[PDB]
Amino acid sequence: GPGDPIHGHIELHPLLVRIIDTPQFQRLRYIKQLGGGYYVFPGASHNRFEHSLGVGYLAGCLVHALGEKQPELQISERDVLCVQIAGLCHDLGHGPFSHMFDGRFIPLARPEVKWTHEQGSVMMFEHLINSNGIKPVMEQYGLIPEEDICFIKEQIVGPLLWPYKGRPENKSFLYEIVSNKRNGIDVDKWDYFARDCHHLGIQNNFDYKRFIKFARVCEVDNELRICARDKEVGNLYDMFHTRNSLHRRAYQHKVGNIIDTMITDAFLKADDYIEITGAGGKKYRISTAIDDMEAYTKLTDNIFLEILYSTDPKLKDAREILKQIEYRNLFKYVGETQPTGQIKIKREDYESLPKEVASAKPKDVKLKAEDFIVDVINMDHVSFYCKEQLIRVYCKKVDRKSLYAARQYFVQWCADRNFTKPQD
Amino acid sequence: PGDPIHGHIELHPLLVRIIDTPQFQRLRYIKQLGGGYYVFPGASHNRFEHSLGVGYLAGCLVHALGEKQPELQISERDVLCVQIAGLCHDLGHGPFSHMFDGRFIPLARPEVKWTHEQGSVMMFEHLINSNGIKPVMEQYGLIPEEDICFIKEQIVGPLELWPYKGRPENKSFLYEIVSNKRNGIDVDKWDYFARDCHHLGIQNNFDYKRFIKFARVCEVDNELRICARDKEVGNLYDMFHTRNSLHRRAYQHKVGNIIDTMITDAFLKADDYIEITGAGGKKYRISTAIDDMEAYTKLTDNIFLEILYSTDPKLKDAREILKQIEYRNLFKYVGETQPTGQIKIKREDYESLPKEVASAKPKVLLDVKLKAEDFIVDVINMDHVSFYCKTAPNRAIAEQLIRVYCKKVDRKSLYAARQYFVQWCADRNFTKPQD
Numbered sequence: 005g006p007g008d009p010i011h012g013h014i015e016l017h018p019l020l021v022r023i024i025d026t027p028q029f030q031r032l033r034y035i036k037q038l039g040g041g042y043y044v045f046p047g048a049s050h051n052r053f054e055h056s057l058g059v060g061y062l063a064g065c066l067v068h069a070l071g072e073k074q075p076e077l078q079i080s081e082r083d084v085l086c087v088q089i090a091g092l093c094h095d096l097g098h099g100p101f102s103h104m105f106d107g108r109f110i111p112l113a114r115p116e117v118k119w120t121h122e123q124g125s126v127m128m129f130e131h132l133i134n135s136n137g138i139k140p141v142m143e144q145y146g147l148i149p150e151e152d153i154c155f156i157k158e159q160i161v162g163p164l165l166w167p168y169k170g171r172p173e174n175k176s177f178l179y180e181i182v183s184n185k186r187n188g189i190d191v192d193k194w195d196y197f198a199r200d201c202h203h204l205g206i207q208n209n210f211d212y213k214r215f216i217k218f219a220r221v222c223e224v225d226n227e228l229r230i231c232a233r234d235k236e237v238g239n240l241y242d243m244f245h246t247r248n249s250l251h252r253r254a255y256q257h258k259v260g261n262i263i264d265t266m267i268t269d270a271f272l273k274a275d276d277y278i279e280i281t282g283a284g285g286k287k288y289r290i291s292t293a294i295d296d297m298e299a300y301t302k303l304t305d306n307i308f309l310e311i312l313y314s315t316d317p318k319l320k321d322a323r324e325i326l327k328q329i330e331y332r333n334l335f336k337y338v339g340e341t342q343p344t345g346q347i348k349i350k351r352e353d354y355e356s357l358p359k360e361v362a363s364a365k366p367k368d369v370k371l372k373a374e375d376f377i378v379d380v381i382n383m384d385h386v387s388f389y390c391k392e393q394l395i396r397v398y399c400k401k402v403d404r405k406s407l408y409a410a411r412q413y414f415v416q417w418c419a420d421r422n423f424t425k426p427q428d
Numbered sequence: 429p430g431d432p433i434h435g436h437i438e439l440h441p442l443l444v445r446i447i448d449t450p451q452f453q454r455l456r457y458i459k460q461l462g463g464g465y466y467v468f469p470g471a472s473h474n475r476f477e478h479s480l481g482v483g484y485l486a487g488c489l490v491h492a493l494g495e496k497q498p499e500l501q502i503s504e505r506d507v508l509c510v511q512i513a514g515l516c517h518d519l520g521h522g523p524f525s526h527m528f529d530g531r532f533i534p535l536a537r538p539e540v541k542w543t544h545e546q547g548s549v550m551m552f553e554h555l556i557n558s559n560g561i562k563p564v565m566e567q568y569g570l571i572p573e574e575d576i577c578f579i580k581e582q583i584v585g586p587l588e589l590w591p592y593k594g595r596p597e598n599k600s601f602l603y604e605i606v607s608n609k610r611n612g613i614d615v616d617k618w619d620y621f622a623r624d625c626h627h628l629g630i631q632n633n634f635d636y637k638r639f640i641k642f643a644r645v646c647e648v649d650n651e652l653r654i655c656a657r658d659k660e661v662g663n664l665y666d667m668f669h670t671r672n673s674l675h676r677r678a679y680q681h682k683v684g685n686i687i688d689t690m691i692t693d694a695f696l697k698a699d700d701y702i703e704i705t706g707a708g709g710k711k712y713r714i715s716t717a718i719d720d721m722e723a724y725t726k727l728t729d730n731i732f733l734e735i736l737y738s739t740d741p742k743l744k745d746a747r748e749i750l751k752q753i754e755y756r757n758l759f760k761y762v763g764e765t766q767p768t769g770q771i772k773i774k775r776e777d778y779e780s781l782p783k784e785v786a787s788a789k790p791k792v793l794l795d796v797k798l799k800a801e802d803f804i805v806d807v808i809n810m811d812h813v814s815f816y817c818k819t820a821p822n823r824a825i826a827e828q829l830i831r832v833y834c835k836k837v838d839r840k841s842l843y844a845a846r847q848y849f850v851q852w853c854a855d856r857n858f859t860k861p862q863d
């Protein structure tokens with residue numbers, strides 16, 4: 005019977021539904037989960053809204069199961085609701101086309117500002133419960149707004165000696181359910197592994213239900229962690245194999261990421277000329293709407309069509325790129341390298357990379373920085389019990405004589421930067 | 429990574445030329461089940477993927493009929509045409525698919541007869557004209573004059589003894605592949621059965637591959653039709669059971685259709701104030717963009733957010749309804765009736781129905797008066813297949829329901845609304861509603 009294709013019919017707590025039936029939350033119906041993936045995989049039409057519901061539901065399943073199996077952990081009806089709301093809201097902060105936006109646009113548009121989508125999820129959440137008087141409703145259901153709002157934000161963004169103020173250290177395991185940076189395993193990934201496979205037509209053999217059934221809390225170096233039964237390791241292999249498959253075959257897809265950087269090139273050439281209306285009446289730009297949640301609420305995938313359909317001559321440059329995509333005259337792939345050693349090209353350095361490439365004296369045609377797009381692309385210690393970064397360059401010039409030239413600058417840049425030699 | 433239903437499909441270069449086109453790319457922004465998304469989180473698919481599927485499926489079937497029966501003389505040209513027809517049959521869908529030609533246009537412009545297939549045919553003509561596809565068809569063995577006719581025809585049926593001008597009667601079976609109004613079975617339905625189930629989380633047991641493998645053409649009353657092996661009837665039951673399930677459980681979903689009528693109420697209250705730019709510079713309205721394909725190309729699901737995010741005070745009324753939906757203060761369900769054994773409700777009559785309901789004097793005098801503006805009434809509409817035996821091949825072996833909603837949500841008003849409704853059914857001779 006018609007429900008979520010992955011979790012089926014989920015029924016939620018009235019508090020959870022209050023949070024959902026909200027414009028700050030509904031906002032997620034208009035954010036492609038895999039962003040520019042849609043333009044390469046027809047199946048991938050899902051948005052963060054469904055995903056978010058998934059993670060909320062899954063967060064609850066796990067906490068509630070840990071509770072039943074181990075009453076000694078003293079997991080409360082309150083603790084559960086909090087974890088659910090955290091899973092529910094962890095993605096509130098995603099901007100147009102998901103990771104493309106905090107990952108590439110903002111660092112190109114505003115290199116000085118450190119902005120992450122989780123920061124945004126925390127502001128967006130605060131603004132959500134403020135603009136909808138959710139606080140009186142939390143109190144109604146046994147929540148302590150002061151202590152718990154802290155707890156919720158904390159499990160979304162980490163700490164804002166024992167770092168956290170939302171829960172004591174003896175309930176530390178609750179901080180590994182929605183976001184687990186250490187062991188990679190959280191209910192967040194479980195959901196999006198399941199649906200990215202479901203829409204990409206990829207085999208997914210991980211069984212989170214089985215995993216949840218056999219999960220437990222236990223001491224690991226005098227610290228409480230979520231462990232998995234040893235006889236559950238074959239299921240864990242099946243997960244990581246899926247993670248590796250979604251990555252190798254979809255998230256790193258050659259043309260898929262090319263398109264992503266074109267869409268970003270469109271937004272940039274349009275940033276000056278699109279006004280988003282914020283609090284008070286004040287107007288913001290795409291890149292700057294992150295400064296006010298009133299406006300950010302209205303910054304979704306819509307912005308793409310707003311440019312596409314525009315008639316403004318100021319926006320002709322942007323329109324033309326978005327029109328490149330419909331026709332499929334994409335930027336041309338020039339090659340791939342990765343940094344040897346430890347170093348990762350830092351986000352603040354993105355804006356300058358094309359200036360660098362274009363300045364590389366190779367050992368016919370001259371190319372300028374405007375002709376190069378370079379995008380940086382980034383991404384077994386689990387506990388049991390018994391009963392990196394790759395750089396691709398594209399060229400905006402599509403003629404044979406220019407690509408040969410572009411490859412020449414690229415190979416040299418890798419040379420005098422000490423990145424791995426590209427493959428012919 | 430490919431289509432989750434057909435996997436990796438590779439298409440003819442002509443097909444790709446048609447696809448890499450703004451008139452076609454338009455379909456990336458039309459929710460397949462329209463207002464279904466706001467009730468089933470899974471249903472985020474658009475007509476673009478669907479269209480590709482039907483294109484691909486149209487080809488599979490034609491090409492298979494061809495190999496099994498060379499005597500039918502099915503050409504490389506005949507195949508390409510059927511593929512393009514399947515590929516373009518949905519070009520004319522407007523914002524939120526069926527919600528638009530089925531309800532908005534009949535409320536917005538009751539005088540005009542508009543169907544989405546008409547629009548698919550104009551949109552297609554405009555597509556191959558705006559992208560110089562015709563020189564490319566000739567390049568691949570197509571006869572633009574004869575074939576463009578053929579394509580349009582299998583999308584909209586005869587544009588006017590043997591009705592069609594695109595193909596002779598001896599290749600009549602080609603006209604039952606993409607759109608089959610008679611027996612219900614076409615590759616169109618097969619695709620959207622498969623993906624509506626795939627996104628709705630519904631079991632779909634029909635196996636179109638098996639069906640395609642055992643399909644054949646054969647004489648049925650001196651007419652060439654596509655028949656199915658008799659031993660394929662259990663697969664056919666599995667199909668119809670899925671059709672009925674997608675209908676009972678999803679396409680007729682109580683709250684799903686309510687939301688659809690609110691979105692329609694929003695577009696209507698916004699129709700005056702949104703301008704769409706067409707050919708020449710001329711400006712059109714939502715309801716009127718169907719008169720010019722330049723503008724229609726730019727009429728997609730975007731129009732929804734354009735209203736939602738709008739700051740215009742003229743558009744405050746519309747905004748408020750779309751905001752009703754985010755908050756989930758929906759119109760309230762009042763009841764269901766059908767016109768069993770009565771004359772059905774024609775599309776031209778939709779605009780007048782609320783005036784009727786509101787004018788129905790109920791038997792007992794009611795503590796509240798309601799006006800037409802307070803009622804939303806929506807009309808909701810929707811085994812003779814031919815078989816053959818291995819032995820002797822080549823020869824063959826509800827309708828409309830009306831629901832009423834109320835825009836007033838207080839208890840004392842709903843009770844009133846139900847009263848008008850029950851009476852309207854009375855003096856209209858529709859079935860008595862269920863308590």
Ligand SMILES: [Zn+2]
Nearest residue numbers: 059095192196
């Ligand atoms: Zn997530």
Ligand SMILES: [Zn+2]
Nearest residue numbers: 482518616620
């Ligand atoms: Zn269709």
